[PDB]
Design a protein around this ligand. Structure first.
Ligand SMILES: Nc1ncnc2c1ncn2[C@@H]1O[C@H](COP(=O)(O)OP(=O)(O)OP(=O)(O)O)[C@@H](O)[C@H]1O
Ligand SMILES: Nc1ncnc2c1ncn2[C@@H]1O[C@H](COP(=O)(O)OP(=O)(O)OP(=O)(O)O)[C@@H](O)[C@H]1O
Ligand SMILES: Nc1ncnc2c1ncn2[C@@H]1O[C@H](COP(=O)(O)OP(=O)(O)OP(=O)(O)O)[C@@H](O)[C@H]1O
Lengths: 156, 157, 156, 156, 156, 156
């Protein structure tokens, strides 16, 4: 519990919300793994490596963090990791019941694996990766919405 | 505020619920711009151009309504028209928090951009575009759910 | 409909979120009636007299805003002023389906009467009267949550 | 009314949640029709004919249950079977107002057709087809999530 | 499961909802028991005996419906009636997760007792007893919201 | 940080869910303070003296858990214990947005104070103190929903 947390997502792209979660979650663990899924199902906008490199670039000055990709069931990724704690974010627009369902379905697959929920700062309470995508797609100013370390590649 | 409101949505297709919001909200501004967003992210059942035609036909009777299509960001649209107030509809099946969220995003992209929410008549309170789509795709009769002026166009696949 | 809108409430007490709704709504109507409800069943923390004085102090700066104490059904208040628009606040914690219900209930009693919903600003999105009352009850600092003019009165 | 109910679904695949609704609903009507929709717009993991086969196998022990495969409008299907009751399952992640919406719509398309809601057992309240699908696609144990009768045809 | 259903509630007062539901559910069981709970702890506006009288007057035309007033545990009342089905209405403002919670609580107190959910007609989907009470408290007109055979008893 | 977490509430009464959260949360902090709040304006079924005793009895086995009665601002308690983490539980029946609003309100009164959320086990996912109170008040058996150490006191 008090050792190795995993924070999974698509990180498409990473936002200031994701970064608050990584921050707070960071304080609480020894190693924290940022687990960038592939999420072929959800239509990805940025390539897994673009995404993984963006997080990598945003997560660098967090001395506890490591970022990585993966494909299969999150529950097993945690097994491989001798990880009993999933970190998830909660926000105004979260589908709360779906989150709870995922936490139990993860528990059901790996009887050792708990989920823990953190919230972003009030300023980031309404940021979703989805609105950020549209802002980027229609060419808006997303600069107060994502970490500056990624301005370069969001523009390419 | 009195001068210009914009009512933006996907309108896929426009529904009697939408028309209630347009009716009521038009009364409140000198001009109402109804703005049909391309919305590529969802895979709209109807084309951008079909949706614009549909809503033009449906809104002809409202003297101070103008329908455009935009593939811009809504903030630029607003700027273009010196518009400070967006209009949005609320219905029983709305995703209320997602609508609040859009409302704050729209403000922060355009600092004088506020959103105002209307509700349709009770008869149309359970109508969404999404349930009209399903009825239509399954060859059901949706003519009670949509203005009669678009019924020719919905009839084509 | 442009002539006159009514924003009813308990205003127990008036908060910065309520002031945002007054400000924006007063910009859209020739007059804005702020109607202060008895709210008997609620057993408010502050008396009617206190609540009405706080509304008047907070709203001095808005030249076209008037205050009135009232009792009971929104629909009849609205016919008394020949008003077709009720203004309502929407927030993260709003019970939205109940808002919709009230709006229909009110149009039933009075067929001309529409309900129109404003939001507060982001920094007030999480502010409720109720939370404000805990802070004052527990003798915390509520000064960043309520208008400055009210502040002397709100302190017991 | 009691002479006949229909329980429509994609059943992709049938899960222990579905079997609870079928069991309980079959207890209330003389006949229950379990109606497996092609649901071509979805992109079902299993073909219509496998889904149909699997739910037939899973329901043979319920003597008053009959399965059929259909394509188009359910409200019309129901008229063909002289059905006045559509059976729906509620579970923890249901979109509740959407369920009500669907009920009212189906009633506007067929004025005899009411919707009635059952719930699964507590154990199955958190079970979604979607989740069973992911697990199945990977190397996951779904044997506790779907009826034994079908767990063979799953990896076929 | 066919012979007898119970439809519990406070019925304070009975609305054109308690009634669409009585109508619909009474078509499914040989006998429908309408159980008026004393509900002491909600301080109902109308007394138990008044609510009972209202609901009897309003359900006289339904030949297989019987009304009873009670106050213990509803699960134990169900047992006394050899009842395996609790009937509940869902409406736009229902707290859905609370209804599911209740259905599971009762199931755990009486292992034969399931909960089944109906909806009222669309026109009544917004009707709430509390909205009827508030209209009444404030001398409004509630006559289009409650069945006509109770209108004498409520104007009083 | 990790040194100290606080789990506040009414605990009216402590339930199996609360206990699941204490279990899990106590494994992330050296010390966990269960902070018993005074239920102001909340219809408290059990006395403060009862609630504190039930939770001490029930948490005797967890060695790093201390239980205290607090009659002040929560954010302030946290300051007094030099605590930057509030532990909270998430359930199926939670008011999700209200919980978030509370997280944010506490941050604004104490800028160091973060909120972390746990789920209980699946079996307890639908349990709340509210449904336990109602079952106890109606004289039903709540022995499966509350820890065995507090049964004596409940019947007080
Ligand atoms: N603004 C935010 N603040 C805090 N947490 C967030 C925020 N947005 C998302 N999260 C959470 O962080 C985790 C990872 O989410 P992910 O990277 O998949 O993006 P997303 O925001 O869910 O969007 P999408 O699924 O559309 O890509 C989830 O637990 C999610 O709820
Ligand atoms: N675990 C469950 N328990 C009870 N009812 C369920 C469960 N899962 C689905 N249902 C309900 O049973 C019926 C059939 O649903 P359907 O077959 O369309 O699958 P689904 O679970 O909605 O998944 P998908 O759309 O991913 O294929 C619907 O009434 C549905 O809501
Ligand atoms: N508008 C409605 N339409 C259909 N069913 C309803 C409606 N309101 C309540 N019900 C159902 O009727 C039953 C009786 O509910 P009850 O008499 O407790 O009234 P209520 O509407 O919950 O009001 P209150 O709890 O404020 O007294 C409940 O089991 C509920 O499932």
């Amino acid at each position: 519990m008090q050792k190795i947390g995993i924070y999974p997502g698509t990180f498409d792209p990473v936002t200031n919300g994701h970064i608050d979660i990584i921050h707070r979650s960071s304080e609480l663990f020894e190693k924290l793994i940022v687990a960038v899924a592939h999420s072929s199902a959800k239509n990805p906008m940025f390539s897994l490596d673009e995404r993984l490199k963006m997080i990598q670039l945003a997560t660098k000055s967090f001395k506890n963090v490591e970022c990585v990709a993966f494909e299969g069931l999150l529950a097993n990724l945690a097994k491989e990791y001798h990880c009993k704690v999933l970190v998830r974010g909660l926000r105004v627009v979260s589908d709360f019941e779906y989150e709870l369902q995922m936490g139990y379905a993860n528990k059901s697959l790996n009887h050792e694996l708990e989920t823990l929920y953190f919230m972003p700062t009030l300023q980031n309470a309404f940021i979703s990766s989805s609105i950020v995508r549209s802002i980027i797609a229609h060419k808006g100013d997303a600069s107060h919405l994502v970490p500056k370390e990624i301005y370069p590649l969001i523009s390419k």
